[PDB]
PDB file of C-alpha atoms in Angstrom:
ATOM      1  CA  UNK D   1      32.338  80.743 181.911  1.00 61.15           C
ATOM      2  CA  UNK D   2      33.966  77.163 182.137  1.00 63.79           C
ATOM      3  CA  UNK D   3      37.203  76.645 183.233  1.00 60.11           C
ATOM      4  CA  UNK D   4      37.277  73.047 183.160  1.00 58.81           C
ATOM      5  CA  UNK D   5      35.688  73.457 179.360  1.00 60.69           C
ATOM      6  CA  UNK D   6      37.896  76.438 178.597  1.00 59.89           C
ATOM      7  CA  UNK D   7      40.974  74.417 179.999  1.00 64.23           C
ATOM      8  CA  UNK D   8      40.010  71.513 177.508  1.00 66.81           C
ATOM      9  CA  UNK D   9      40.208  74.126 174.846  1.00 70.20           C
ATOM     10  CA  UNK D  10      43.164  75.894 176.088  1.00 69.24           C
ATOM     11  CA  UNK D  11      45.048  72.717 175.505  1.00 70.81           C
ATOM     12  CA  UNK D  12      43.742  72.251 172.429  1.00 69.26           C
ATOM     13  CA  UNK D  13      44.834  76.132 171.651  1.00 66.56           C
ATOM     14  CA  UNK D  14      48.293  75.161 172.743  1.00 69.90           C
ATOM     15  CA  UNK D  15      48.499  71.758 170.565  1.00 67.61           C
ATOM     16  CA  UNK D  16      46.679  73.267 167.663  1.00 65.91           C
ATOM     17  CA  UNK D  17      49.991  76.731 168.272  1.00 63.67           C
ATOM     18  CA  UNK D  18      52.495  74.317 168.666  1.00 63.18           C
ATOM     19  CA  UNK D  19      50.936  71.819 166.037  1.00 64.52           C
ATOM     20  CA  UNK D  20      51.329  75.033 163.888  1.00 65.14           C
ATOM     21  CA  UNK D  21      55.023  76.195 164.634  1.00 66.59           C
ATOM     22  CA  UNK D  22      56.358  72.203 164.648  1.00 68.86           C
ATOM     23  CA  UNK D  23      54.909  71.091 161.584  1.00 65.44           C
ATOM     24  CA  UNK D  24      55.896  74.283 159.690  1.00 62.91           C
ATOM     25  CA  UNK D  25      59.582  73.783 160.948  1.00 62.95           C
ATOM     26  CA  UNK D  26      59.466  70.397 161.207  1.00 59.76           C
ATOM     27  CA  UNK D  27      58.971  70.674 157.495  1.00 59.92           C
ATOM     28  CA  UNK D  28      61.121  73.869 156.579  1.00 57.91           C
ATOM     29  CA  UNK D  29      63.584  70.637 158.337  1.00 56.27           C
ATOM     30  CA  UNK D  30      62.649  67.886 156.011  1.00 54.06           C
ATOM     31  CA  UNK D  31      63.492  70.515 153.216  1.00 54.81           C
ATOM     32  CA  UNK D  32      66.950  72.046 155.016  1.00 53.70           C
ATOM     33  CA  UNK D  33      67.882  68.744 155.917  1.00 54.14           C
ATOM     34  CA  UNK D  34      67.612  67.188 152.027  1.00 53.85           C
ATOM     35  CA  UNK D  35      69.134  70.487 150.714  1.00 53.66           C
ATOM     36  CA  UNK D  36      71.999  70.915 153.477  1.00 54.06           C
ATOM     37  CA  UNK D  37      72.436  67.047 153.150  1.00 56.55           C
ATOM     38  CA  UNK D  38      73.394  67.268 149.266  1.00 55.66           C
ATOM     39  CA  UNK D  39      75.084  70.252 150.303  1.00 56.84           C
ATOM     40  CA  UNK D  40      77.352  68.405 152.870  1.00 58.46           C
ATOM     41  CA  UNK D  41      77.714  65.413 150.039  1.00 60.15           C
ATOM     42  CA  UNK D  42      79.221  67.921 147.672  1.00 63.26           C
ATOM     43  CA  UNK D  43      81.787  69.453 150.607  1.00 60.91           C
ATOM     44  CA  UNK D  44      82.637  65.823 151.035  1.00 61.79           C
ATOM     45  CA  UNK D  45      83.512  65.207 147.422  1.00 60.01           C
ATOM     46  CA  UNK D  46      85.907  68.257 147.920  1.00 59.71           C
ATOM     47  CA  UNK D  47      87.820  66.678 150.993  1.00 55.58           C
ATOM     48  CA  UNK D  48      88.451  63.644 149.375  1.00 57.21           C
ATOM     49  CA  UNK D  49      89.759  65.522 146.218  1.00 54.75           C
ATOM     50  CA  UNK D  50      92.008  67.162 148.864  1.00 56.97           C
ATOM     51  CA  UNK D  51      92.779  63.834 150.336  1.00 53.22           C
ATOM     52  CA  UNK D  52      93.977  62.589 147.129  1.00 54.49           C
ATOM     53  CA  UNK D  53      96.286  65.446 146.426  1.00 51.93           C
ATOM     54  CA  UNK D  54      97.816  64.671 149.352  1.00 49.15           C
TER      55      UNK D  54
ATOM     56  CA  UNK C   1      93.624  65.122 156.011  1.00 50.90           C
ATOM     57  CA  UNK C   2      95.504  67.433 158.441  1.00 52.88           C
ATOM     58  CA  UNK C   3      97.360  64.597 159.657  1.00 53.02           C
ATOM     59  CA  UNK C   4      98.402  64.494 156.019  1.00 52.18           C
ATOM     60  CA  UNK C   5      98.895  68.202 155.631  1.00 50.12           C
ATOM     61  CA  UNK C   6     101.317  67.674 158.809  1.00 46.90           C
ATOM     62  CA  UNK C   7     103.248  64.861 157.094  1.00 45.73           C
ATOM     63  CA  UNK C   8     103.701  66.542 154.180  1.00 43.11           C
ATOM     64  CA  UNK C   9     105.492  69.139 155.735  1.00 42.22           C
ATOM     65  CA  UNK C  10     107.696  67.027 157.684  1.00 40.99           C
ATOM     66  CA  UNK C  11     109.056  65.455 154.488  1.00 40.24           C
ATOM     67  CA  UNK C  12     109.454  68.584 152.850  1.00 37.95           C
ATOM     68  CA  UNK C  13     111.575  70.202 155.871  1.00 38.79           C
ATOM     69  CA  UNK C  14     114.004  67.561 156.097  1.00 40.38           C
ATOM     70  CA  UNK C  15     114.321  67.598 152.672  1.00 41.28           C
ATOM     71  CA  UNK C  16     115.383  71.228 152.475  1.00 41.66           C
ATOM     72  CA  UNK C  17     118.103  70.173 155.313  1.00 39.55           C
ATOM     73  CA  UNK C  18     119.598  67.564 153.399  1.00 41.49           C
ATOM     74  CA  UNK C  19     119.558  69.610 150.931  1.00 39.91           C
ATOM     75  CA  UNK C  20     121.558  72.658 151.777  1.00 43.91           C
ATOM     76  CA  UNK C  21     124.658  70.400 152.699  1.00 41.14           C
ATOM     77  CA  UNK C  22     125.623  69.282 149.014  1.00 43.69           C
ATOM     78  CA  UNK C  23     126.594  73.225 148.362  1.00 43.45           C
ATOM     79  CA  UNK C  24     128.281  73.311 151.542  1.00 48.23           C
ATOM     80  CA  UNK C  25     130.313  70.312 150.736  1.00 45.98           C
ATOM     81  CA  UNK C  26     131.215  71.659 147.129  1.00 47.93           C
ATOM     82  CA  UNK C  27     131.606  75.164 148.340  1.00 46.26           C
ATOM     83  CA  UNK C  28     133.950  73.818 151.062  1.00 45.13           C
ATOM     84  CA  UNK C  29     136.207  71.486 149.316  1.00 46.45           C
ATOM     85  CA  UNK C  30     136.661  74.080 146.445  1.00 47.05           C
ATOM     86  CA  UNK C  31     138.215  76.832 148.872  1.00 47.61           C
ATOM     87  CA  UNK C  32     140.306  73.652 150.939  1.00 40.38           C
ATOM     88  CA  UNK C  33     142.143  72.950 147.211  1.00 40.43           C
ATOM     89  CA  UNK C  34     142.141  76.344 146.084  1.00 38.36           C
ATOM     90  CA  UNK C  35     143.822  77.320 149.578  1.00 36.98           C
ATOM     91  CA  UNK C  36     145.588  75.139 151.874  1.00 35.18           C
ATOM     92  CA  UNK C  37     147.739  72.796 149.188  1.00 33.30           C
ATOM     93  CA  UNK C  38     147.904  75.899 146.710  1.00 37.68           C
ATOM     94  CA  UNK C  39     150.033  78.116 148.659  1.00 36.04           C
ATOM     95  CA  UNK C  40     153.731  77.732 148.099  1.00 33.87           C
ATOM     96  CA  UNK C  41     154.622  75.552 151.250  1.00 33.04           C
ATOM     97  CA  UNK C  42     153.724  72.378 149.488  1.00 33.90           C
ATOM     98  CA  UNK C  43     156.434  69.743 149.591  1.00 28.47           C
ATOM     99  CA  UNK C  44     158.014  69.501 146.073  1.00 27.21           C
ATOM    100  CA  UNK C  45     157.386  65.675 146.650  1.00 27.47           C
ATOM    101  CA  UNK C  46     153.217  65.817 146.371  1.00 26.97           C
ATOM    102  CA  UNK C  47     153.649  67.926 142.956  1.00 27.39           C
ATOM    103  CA  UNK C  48     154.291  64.793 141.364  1.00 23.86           C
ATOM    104  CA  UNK C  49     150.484  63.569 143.300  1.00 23.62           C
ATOM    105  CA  UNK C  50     149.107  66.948 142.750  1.00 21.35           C
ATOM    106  CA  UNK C  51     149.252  67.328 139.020  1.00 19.45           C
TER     107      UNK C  51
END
């Protein structure tokens, strides 16, 4: 019946969706990034042993 | 550690080139003796050298 009260809560809608869909990748990112950053560490250790071969 | 890589085969090329030439050298002075101061034009004189 409101717009300017249903706007209010439209934005909210929207903040509260993309609250929802940013804070669960946001934190599916604070676990890739740890994993895929120990990951990267260990790739590392393998160019340098193929550094030192060289 | 491509810029190695590369390196690595530069030094391995050119040491394959210099390579090869040691068996061309012995190959070639083997067949000079056996051949061109063998035959029987060689001045008498040089047999004394030669043996």
């Amino acid at each position: 019946d409101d717009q300017f009260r249903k706007l209010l809560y439209k934005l909210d809608l929207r903040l509260f969706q993309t609250i929802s869909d940013q804070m669960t990748r946001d934190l599916k990112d604070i676990l890739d990034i740890n994993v895929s950053n120990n990951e990267l560490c260990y790739q590392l250790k393998q160019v340098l042993a193929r550094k030192e071969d060289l | 550690n491509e810029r190695l890589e590369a390196i690595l085969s530069r030094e391995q090329n050119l040491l394959e080139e210099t390579r090869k030439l040691c068996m061309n050298l012995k190959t070639n002075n083997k067949k000079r003796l056996t051949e061109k101061l063998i035959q029987k034009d060689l001045h008498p004189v040089l047999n004394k050298a030669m043996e």
